[PDB]
């Protein structure tokens, strides 16, 4: 499930 936020 990929990162959907602006930062990692």
């Amino acid at each position: 499930n990929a990162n959907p936020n602006v930062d990692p």
């Epitope: 990162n3 936020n5 602006v6 990692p8």
Partner: antibody
Framework: QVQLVESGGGVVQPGRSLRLSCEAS????????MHWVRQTPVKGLEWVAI????????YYTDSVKGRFTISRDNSKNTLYLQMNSLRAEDTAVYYC??????????????????????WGQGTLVTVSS | DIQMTQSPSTLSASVGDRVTITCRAS??????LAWYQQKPGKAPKFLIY???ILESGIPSRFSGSGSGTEFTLTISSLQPDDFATYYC????????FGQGTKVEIKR
């Protein structure tokens, strides 16, 4: 404090439409992806949809494809769930939730996966004639 | 697609007891397993992630273990605030939940 507040729930006839809203406070709304999740007493918890922080990507659970649309208005700090062609089986409490890294914050690498936390109080959608 | 099954559906316990709840996945989810706590009329609250990492602010009496397809949530010494329903959630491929385990008061 981080707070999400859902609104827009109510009684809607089968085949009709309804738009849910989720207003965010206590954080930079446009920095986070967001989710909708729903709950029924018998069937339990079911993830509904996800949207990227800037609206640039989104996807849905199979049972709502072609009928629900997730969107956001970052100028209003608000998340939306447009629900068209509603069915009895869409009756549920609908929660919004903030995307969450399911790994230590300091870890950087391929072994990472995301989930969601900080759910709101929810809003009840009742599809009935 | 990945089905989560919790056991038991309802568990009775006393304040001070050690409680363990089981969660089983239909296929390997690595360690991408989260636990939530829910009180009646309230939203689920994030407790544990990565099978065993405690979320900040969650009391140390909560612990999680497991790998592959078998996971456990343990409360070392149950307190009155812990009577609630607990849900596991895999977040390896999309997001799916167990049916929940309700922890009730033994008598």
């Amino acid at each position: 404090q981080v707070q999400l507040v859902e609104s827009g729930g109510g009684v809607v006839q089968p085949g009709r439409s309804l738009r849910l809203s989720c207003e965010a406070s206590g954080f930079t709304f446009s920095n986070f992806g967001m989710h909708w999740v729903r709950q029924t007493p018998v069937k339990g918890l079911e993830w509904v949809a996800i949207i990227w922080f800037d609206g640039s990507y989104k996807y849905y659970t199979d049972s709502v494809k072609g009928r629900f649309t997730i969107s956001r208005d970052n100028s209003k700090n608000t998340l939306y769930l447009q629900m068209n062609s509603l069915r009895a089986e869409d009756t549920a409490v609908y929660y919004c939730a903030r995307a969450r890294k399911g790994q230590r914050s300091d870890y950087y690498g391929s072994e990472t996966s995301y989930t969601f936390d900080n759910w709101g109080q929810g809003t009840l959608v009742t599809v009935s004639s | 697609d990945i089905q989560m099954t919790q056991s038991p559906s309802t568990l009775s316990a006393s304040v001070g007891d050690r409680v363990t709840i089981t969660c089983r996945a239909s296929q390997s989810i690595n360690g991408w397993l989260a636990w939530y706590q829910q009180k009646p009329g309230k939203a689920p609250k994030f407790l544990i992630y990565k099978a065993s990492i405690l979320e900040s602010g969650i009391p140390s009496r909560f612990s999680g273990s497991g790998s592959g397809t078998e996971f456990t949530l343990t409360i070392s010494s149950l307190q009155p605030d812990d009577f609630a329903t607990y849900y596991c959630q895999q977040y390896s491929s999309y997001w799916t939940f167990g049916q929940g385990t309700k922890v009730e008061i033994k008598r």
